[PDB]
Design a protein around this nucleic acid. Sequence first.
DNA 1: CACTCTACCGATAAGCAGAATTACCTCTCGATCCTGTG
RNA 2: ACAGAUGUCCUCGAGAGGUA
Lengths: 56, 57, 83
Amino acid sequence: NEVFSRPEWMILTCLPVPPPPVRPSISFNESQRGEDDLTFKLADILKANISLETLE
Amino acid sequence: PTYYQRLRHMVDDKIHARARGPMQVLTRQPVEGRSRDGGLRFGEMERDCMIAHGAAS
Amino acid sequence: AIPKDQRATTPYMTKYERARILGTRALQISMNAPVFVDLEGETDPLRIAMKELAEKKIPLVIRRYLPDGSFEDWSVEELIVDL
DNA sequence: CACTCTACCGATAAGCAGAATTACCTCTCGATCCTGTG
RNA sequence: ACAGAUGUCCUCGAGAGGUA
């Protein structure tokens, strides 16, 4: 589609991050806090991007 | 006379009823299990049976 | 578009139509809304709705949609209730 | 008139991917180290 | 000049044993 879906948009150049409601944090046990797998994967992606930027 | 055994399944351990109980976090849907005051599940079979009945509302 | 009065649907009321009008009228009477019949000692909104429908005193209009998109309006009083 | 590969489709044969009834009850565990430090 | 506490539900992925 000319406006709705162009072929050049198929390459990911900007990655949106889901809001906290999409990936909430569980209660875990008492005095313990954990994060969803989405948060850890997003942090890994951000670390990889930062490493690539610094290396370039 | 006839020998009879009492099984482990009793009605007192299976009766459940919910009306606006605890909420979930992710999907904001009723929780699972009787011990957690959960709600009954409306499956796809119930949905299509109600479709066949014609009760859209 | 509306098919004038050269309508070609059925001159009777379907079961789904009967249920929908009965439910809408029951809800309207359950809320504070005027009643156009003699309650005569009835206090359940659904029974009041059936009493209103007995002599076709319900001011409701049925809009039957054709699959193409056209629709023809049928009055409740002009719909035969045989079921 | 068949001499040699050039362009065409019609079979055959191995590699991927999905997906497997519905509802309910109970218990039981696991959500991290060590080489490198002052 | 002023100002010391409370808001109710937390698991989650799995595994096993069973009921129609």
